[PDB]
Design a protein around this ligand. Sequence first.
Ligand SMILES: O=C(O)[C@H]1O[C@H](OP(=O)(O)OP(=O)(O)OC[C@H]2O[C@@H](n3ccc(=O)[nH]c3=O)[C@H](O)[C@@H]2O)[C@H](O)[C@@H](O)[C@@H]1O
Ligand SMILES: O=C(O)[C@H]1O[C@H](OP(=O)(O)OP(=O)(O)OC[C@H]2O[C@@H](n3ccc(=O)[nH]c3=O)[C@H](O)[C@@H]2O)[C@H](O)[C@@H](O)[C@@H]1O
Lengths: 454, 455
Amino acid sequence: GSMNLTIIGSGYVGLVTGACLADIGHDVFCLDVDQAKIDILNNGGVPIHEPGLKEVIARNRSAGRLRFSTDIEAAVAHGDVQFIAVGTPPDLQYVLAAARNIGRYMTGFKVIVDKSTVPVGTAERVRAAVAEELAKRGGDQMFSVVSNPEFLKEGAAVDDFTRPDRIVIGCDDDVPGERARELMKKLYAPFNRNHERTLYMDVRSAEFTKYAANAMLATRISFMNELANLADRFGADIEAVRRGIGSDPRIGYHFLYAGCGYGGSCFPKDVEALIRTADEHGQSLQILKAVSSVNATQKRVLADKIVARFGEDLTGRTFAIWGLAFKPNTDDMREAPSRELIAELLSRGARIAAYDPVAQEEARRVIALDLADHPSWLERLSFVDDEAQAARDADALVIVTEWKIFKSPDFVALGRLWKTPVIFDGRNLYEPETMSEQGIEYHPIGRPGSRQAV
Amino acid sequence: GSMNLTIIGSGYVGLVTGACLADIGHDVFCLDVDQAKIDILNNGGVPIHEPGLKEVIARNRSAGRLRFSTDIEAAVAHGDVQFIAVGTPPDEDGSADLQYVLAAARNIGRYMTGFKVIVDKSTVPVGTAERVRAAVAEELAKRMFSVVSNPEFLKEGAAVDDFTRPDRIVIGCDDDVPGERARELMKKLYAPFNRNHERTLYMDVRSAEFTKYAANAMLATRISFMNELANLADRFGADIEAVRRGIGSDPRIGYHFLYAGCGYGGSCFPKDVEALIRTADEHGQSLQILKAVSSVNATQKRVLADKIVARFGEDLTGRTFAIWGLAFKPNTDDMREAPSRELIAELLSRGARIAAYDPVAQEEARRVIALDLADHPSWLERLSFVDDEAQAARDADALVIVTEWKIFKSPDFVALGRLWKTPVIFDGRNLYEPETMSEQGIEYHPIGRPGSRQA
Ligand SMILES: O=C(O)[C@H]1O[C@H](OP(=O)(O)OP(=O)(O)OC[C@H]2O[C@@H](n3ccc(=O)[nH]c3=O)[C@H](O)[C@@H]2O)[C@H](O)[C@@H](O)[C@@H]1O
Ligand SMILES: O=C(O)[C@H]1O[C@H](OP(=O)(O)OP(=O)(O)OC[C@H]2O[C@@H](n3ccc(=O)[nH]c3=O)[C@H](O)[C@@H]2O)[C@H](O)[C@@H](O)[C@@H]1O
């Protein structure tokens, strides 16, 4: 039943993977070279915004199934299966360094699992690195490198790990590959007690799958954003079109919400990576280039509409911003559309009052960096603790991230605060007709505006 | 519950819509101006390849719920709801001709007494319902109604099933009093389909018009997306079918319409994506993604010939290729935009001899390919069509699979071995497992996967 596992990288993917595998009964050693992070974890803290994770870590540490250490040798000796879950910042040196440490110390068969999102062909480089360490030692030790990508969503990662749609395992079919596949089967057995959730394939195809999946999700979004722009010209309603096409089971209903673009640390990075490596291989990915181009423009749509409505010089104007994080339920600001919007508005002289239920501190940090070259613009940026207060004296309210708290606001209270009842909605939260009936000039994406907007 | 309905257009969308609405108890008048077609229908004949249709027609003629006539005034007088289901054939310009829908609209307005719901059922560009309304009001002025968009989501060869068990019914109606009146009539009309599960989606007219194009555009996008990744899979040494399993297993993406191959055809996808691209360009918007999907599909239709040239050389004089599949998809004789037409033209242009087989599309293929290649009678002399699938492989350098008819999924390699010159297969639909092909000594070249060892 229970196996000795090591997770390399105490980051987000690594922590959730390690904690949840400990939670099904495996004995897990989480390695990170950063003593500070390890210290934080061993003092019962959690460096990430991840519901349920602290309590999973806590109960498994107490049960003796989860340990946090910087001790590389102890990590190699512990784990029969070694998950490489280290970052790949804008660079594979860390996954390759992890691989070399396994090769330099291992004394028996190892399954090395590439769990971090890595380019196709990485498993072969990991294999070469481990092999060369073994050749220095003269040892006969055998091993196999497996690709097992992550499909977690920030802020929902514990549930996504615990009830996955599928588990993708790319393995070789030679003798060590089959030995590794058997160990992976045993490792994930508790997830396969009902429907089979594991999908086995070759290593290169598993590596490609992760990029292809995110690329298709991004493609759905940019597809709808281009059609939203066309709906405006046609006098059509993209939300009606969304239900109209999503109701074909071959299309499906999810990931078709037009709005102010996709952000995060996944889609832009994985789409761009796939475009770049295809180009390096002599192929221009026409659809993915278009998807990326559409998204770049779409992240400017809110400010463009604001300029169309109010003029190029926004000095003397105030805008309330609802939503900062790149999506609901996280404090993550990476590639957040709010950052592009706020920079654009500040550059034109506007004042900005911003609200987000959880992301205020991170937004303050990163926007101060974004606009470090314009300290005077930052003097016009404030953050408020209550959503309605952002609207005080505002010429318009701008919705960027569809946090639930924004879905049924107190428009009466808003009416007593704002200068003019104007809403630009990058996430289509409200019915236009309802906004009309409430005296709000409503500017959604791809839908007829309220009558005041027209 | 029974209403009196008129269907204008005794073509494919019209015949299925008319016959199946009669079948749920409505009294249907099917109008068409072509007396020859009306005759074939009243003689118990049916102009199209459509399983189950003839039986449905026969039953409803007998029940007195289905009539066929060329009588316009009778048609307009019968139909409280008037479905416009006429064709929109291309022009030399390649845009859809609306003349027949507007001619139908005008006729309604010329003879109509009392309220009418005019339903645009054939696929038409956003804004067509407004042109129809104006044309009807034009005719009324000389002498109350509402125009509704109710797009069709049928699949040739499965139209009766698709109509009888729809995923959804889209109804686009106006917000005013005539529009509200039409909406209630549409609800009553479709009541039997919503009896146990609500299947109707109501929206405004222009959104319903747009929905039809948007749906087909997304389907085409999924296919071109996978075809571009298939070409990349070759460069990476990955397997596009493994990638399909790996991404389609995310339910936000879903498992359907992710089969890479030799491209999409038919009279719907290329027409509807081209129509979106063109109309958008005419409003000063470039649809970057749809332009890329159309471009990749044009390139994908060259891939099989490309592989054949890579394997045998640029001059195919003295080569013979067997082609399995001609129709644009299985279960139809429809040759519109078929990948087989481009492949066959490219191979013949290089000197090859071609022997082609399809379970039902041979006559249509001969007709349409003779038109395609009318300027090159010497190429046409090198094309023949065979009535048995194995016979196409006689003296063939390679077999090429273009359309995944079920029959091809279980080849008799002993029969093929008694016939072909070299055991080489180019597969544009990925029907077989490359390892299995290796076991059978077949040199196998699929799309986006490593082939057999012999390959
Ligand atoms: O590679 C990863 O680790 C993860 O990347 C994404 O997860 P994430 O980026 O956290 O969140 P999403 O919910 O995918 O949102 C991405 C962006 O798309 C936007 N979006 C999403 C859906 C939609 O319909 N429209 C839309 O604009 C969101 O607002 C957000 O800015 C994927 O959803 C996960 O499956 C994948 O595991
Ligand atoms: O507008 C219409 O009347 C119809 O158009 C298409 O139906 P159709 O073109 O008859 O047939 P499809 O099964 O959609 O096939 C279209 C093309 O895509 C190709 N295809 C399909 C699926 C796939 O995964 N890969 C792929 O290449 C097929 O071989 C074919 O050439 C739509 O599927 C229907 O929903 C729509 O009602």
